[PDB]
Amino acid sequence: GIEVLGVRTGPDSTTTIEAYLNPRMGTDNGFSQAVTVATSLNPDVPPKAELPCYSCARIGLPMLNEDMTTPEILMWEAVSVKTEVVGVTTMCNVHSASIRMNGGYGVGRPIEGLNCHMFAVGGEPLELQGCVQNWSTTYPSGVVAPPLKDAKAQVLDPGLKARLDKDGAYPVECWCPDPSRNENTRYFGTYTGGQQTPPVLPFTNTVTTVLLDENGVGPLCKGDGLYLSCVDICGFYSEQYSQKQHFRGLPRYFSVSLRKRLVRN
Amino acid sequence: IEVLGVRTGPDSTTTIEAYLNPRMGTDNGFSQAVTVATSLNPDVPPKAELPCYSCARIGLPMLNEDMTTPEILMWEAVSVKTEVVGVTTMCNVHSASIRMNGGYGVGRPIEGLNCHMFAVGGEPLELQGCVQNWSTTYPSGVVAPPLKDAKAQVLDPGLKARLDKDGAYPVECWCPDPSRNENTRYFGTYTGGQQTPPVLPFTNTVTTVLLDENGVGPLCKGDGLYLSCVDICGFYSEQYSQKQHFRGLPRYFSVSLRKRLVRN
Amino acid sequence: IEVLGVRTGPDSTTTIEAYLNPRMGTDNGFSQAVTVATSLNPDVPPKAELPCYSCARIGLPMLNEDMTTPEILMWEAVSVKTEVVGVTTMCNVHSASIRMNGGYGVGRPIEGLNCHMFAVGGEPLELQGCVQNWSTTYPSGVVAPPLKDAKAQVLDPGLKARLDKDGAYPVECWCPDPSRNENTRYFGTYTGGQQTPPVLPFTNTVTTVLLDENGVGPLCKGDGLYLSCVDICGFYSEQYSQKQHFRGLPRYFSVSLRKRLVRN
Amino acid sequence: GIEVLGVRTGPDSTTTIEAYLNPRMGTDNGFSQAVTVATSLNPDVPPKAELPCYSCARIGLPMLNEDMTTPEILMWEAVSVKTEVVGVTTMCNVHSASIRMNGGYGVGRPIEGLNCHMFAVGGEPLELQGCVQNWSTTYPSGVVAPPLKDAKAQVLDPGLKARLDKDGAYPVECWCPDPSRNENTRYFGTYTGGQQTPPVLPFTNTVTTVLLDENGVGPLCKGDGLYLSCVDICGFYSEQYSQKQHFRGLPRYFSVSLRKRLVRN
Amino acid sequence: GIEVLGVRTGPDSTTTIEAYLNPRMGTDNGFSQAVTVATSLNPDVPPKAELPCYSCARIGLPMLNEDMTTPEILMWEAVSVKTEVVGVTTMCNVHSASIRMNGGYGVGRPIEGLNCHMFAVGGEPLELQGCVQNWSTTYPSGVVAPPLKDAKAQVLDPGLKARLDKDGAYPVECWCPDPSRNENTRYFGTYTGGQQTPPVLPFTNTVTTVLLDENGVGPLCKGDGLYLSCVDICGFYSEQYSQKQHFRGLPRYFSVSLRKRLVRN
Ligand SMILES: [Cl-]
Ligand SMILES: [Cl-]
Ligand SMILES: [Cl-]
Ligand SMILES: [Cl-]
Ligand SMILES: [Cl-]
Ligand SMILES: [Cl-]
Ligand SMILES: [Cl-]
Ligand SMILES: [Cl-]
Description:
Chains B, C: One of its GO terms (molecular function) is structural molecule activity. The structure is a homopentamer. By secondary structure, chain A is an all-beta fold.
């Protein structure tokens, strides 16, 4: 319910924000703890250190309205983003103690298997819908999980909603971007599953995503905050000896172009 | 229908939002553990093991104060944004699947054959009957084509239906009828194989335009918008038994409509 | 043919709808169980194990009661919408296939090599003979190229035919002739390998335009529209014997035509 | 070299050339001899009959200049090509004595594995750069192979150059199109590797490749010759009993559109 | 930032630079030494001969500015590049002593597995961000590796920066292009992982990459130097007997088209 007026131009009417988000795979430096697997659907008690979570940050922008009593005020409008997964070339490492190919004689398996990549740029926290594979899962304290009162949580229960308002706390497996909300956020997600699937990861500085909607309006930054969200699961690392697996995530870089937009107060 | 001009001005457009939960054979995203015949006859799949199409009819706002005039208005579906919801649930490798690396690694994610379809129309989706095995005995509580001979394994033009009941028309014995559906747009993809990686996008930035060559979208007969889908995402394998279950995910729809004048 | 102007006005356009059922070696979507030679000679594939091209000539409304005038009319095919029918049958994993997960999981779906072709023309599709094994003995009841030497394994320009009989020209010994077919458009894809996932779209929203670089579609000689296809979707494996059968699916065609004036 | 002037139009100013090249996989009829494999890098002595080679032909064009002493002359200019791999549907054969699937009970493996497809259209022979996987390889009598004096032949040694001037004589594995030359040829190549990779082979008569460069100039046919080159390795055939493998290649059709082009003489 | 003025046209205002870079896989001629694999994360001591490194070269350009104090000066602007991996067809070799398919009876495995391809064109050295898979790795004498003082080196530690200023010295696995810098370079990278993944390698002379940014400005060559960078890991070669694996890399050709650009000094 924001009445959007004209773009405000002139000196200092545009700015570019640069930020990076480190991955939250369950521990702080790119890997989950070795993943444990329940023998049945109940009990199913995944430790916090084994659950990849969304990354998020609010970037404070230059204050626009010392006076909020005028019939019009200014908002920062996100018009475009360049975003990069950082450290893709680390997956050329086949010497750091993974399970060896060619019956033990070849190199270590690279990081491989299921991939899940999402980035989002908005003027407020990303809106989430709760959904899980197993409604009987006992989620750990210190992650935010939807309430699991019945099996409808395995499909769409519209009572299960959240905002992505804490970095490294909302597990990827029990929340997805809510397509029924997020009027003021653009999100872009991919999942490529399978067991030992080859990760396919580009890295270029030449690609821009335009964030304008049908009316030529980008996300409008409420309270002069820019909201960045992502997850970048790149596959599993297998330990050579134990053969236990760890999620591997990589950091993401954002460059967001903003302009001043007049709106009705 | 003789299609005339778009009616513009206040309240001439609306957006309909809806979601459809998947009908994989039980109500909460999974089939019952799938059984497999030892021969083509008898072949008796239980209802709880057969994925079915999801469908809904949304009653639309009143737009005609009279239905006897030489022109009337219909809601015209211009575009749709649609999303498979819960794609990130497939990052779960702890909930009691068959373990990789000889039992030492994580559980297999949901994987294998995928079948994704959505449709938006102004009347029920029209189906053509077709089966893999004409000897199959379909269960009580589903709508299956009559199977009188083996031509049901290819195209028997006698085997037609309308998708008019949610969770009742099995995916494996009906497909969208390309000879009908003048007033519905459908979009389907099948990706088969045994352990195939599911590839599932999730974004709020992609719009499908529903206009035909003449610039006319589906026209909502009886002020009904008809949504249909299936989203089989693969199989869940039980760690101990190694039995498999179909997994389906819900689908969200946002449909943009405008008022269209037509000859009555 | 000297092609002149498009004839417009009432009844200047028509749409032809047709379907072709697959010819995999038996009448209802499957080959007989496939046998495999132990050497290149003898190699004697039965007719029931050899997929063949589907084809039909559709009679169009007669245009020229008088064929003596300096100009006459021909039907010109401008576009086609075509669909493989029954794609969703490949969601069936209960009808007696080899079971995954060591016998505990579902049946393998139909998978492996795929070969899909459709063609629309104003005369029969022109074929080039080419085989994998020049020593193959092709059976009675199919049309196969003569095999007098091993050049038949590559391009022997002496080996030509017209697709003039439904279910009679094996796919493996004939391909569309790129040196002919001036008056036919053909569109073919082969995806090989052993257990390869079939990837099969099904939509009513995709149109193929048949106009050449000069804006002219196939011209229907003698008021005949010629439709051809093959749709090998993979192999079905029998649970017990583990023998394999080719699976094919039917194909639907909707062809838009317009009247074109030509010099007589 | 050539100062390019105007396109010559009017009657007889255009022509279409149709040709086919049969594959040269090591024997004349689509297959290599069964392939033998060295136990070490030295000695490594591949027989000619086991080495796929490039196909090539020069097509004579209508003679344009009885008098080659005028200040301007005409050249045939290649503007576009339609090209097709012929015999793709042969790969639906699963009965002709290959290794059987389903533990011997199913159909024969189709032709599968590494694919290499190239076509080229030019106004002079295709220019080649020598490059090998093993500089210790002894190439056979009856093929043209680069001299192998040191291991730089495994990467780029700019001393190792050739012209594709003989059909079925230049092995694919020791020559590639030279990107530093070929000003007057367009080449188009794809390699898809791996062990049992599915071949993906289109066949249509509806696809045209334009051969014009950034200046709107196609290959200019020196001496009224059109030069066609290709290779089409479609994978390996496995013999049911021995399990030895043969390269399989398919023939390629070309239709080339030419127009008369005035040049400075 | 440079204030960019008009393109300078006229005779000698454009030039084309051609160059090739041979790969640096750990030895001089296209292959790493046989790769060794640690049994644990510490110690993990990859020899230099087993670590693929980036290729780079500075190409000297014609000197533009006799007086470097004028209010405007000229810079060479890179507007487009044609780039080719050379030697792709060498991967059709299945005779040179690899592990044999069909249980020893078939041909040798071709080069296959993880691929990593990057090319970059800039007016200064490519800027790098340090990131590793294992912060406990001991990088060898003779390579430039980021300092590894804690596990943040496995994600984005913004302290870990470098410039690609030496050919065959910066390992691919511990450096990636820095998306927070490189304003004056265009880089284009792909990684395709997995164990035995088919390499997919095109080779054509018909494809041009435009290097102009959103404002129509290509990289500007500081000190009249053009900076070229790449890596082309094409997979692993498996030795038939030992079954040890070697990285295989291929050389890359560049053709860069430049024009003179006026800039405010
Ligand atoms: Cl303003
Ligand atoms: Cl941090
Ligand atoms: Cl529900
Ligand atoms: Cl029939
Ligand atoms: Cl002229
Ligand atoms: Cl010949
Ligand atoms: Cl100038
Ligand atoms: Cl060098």
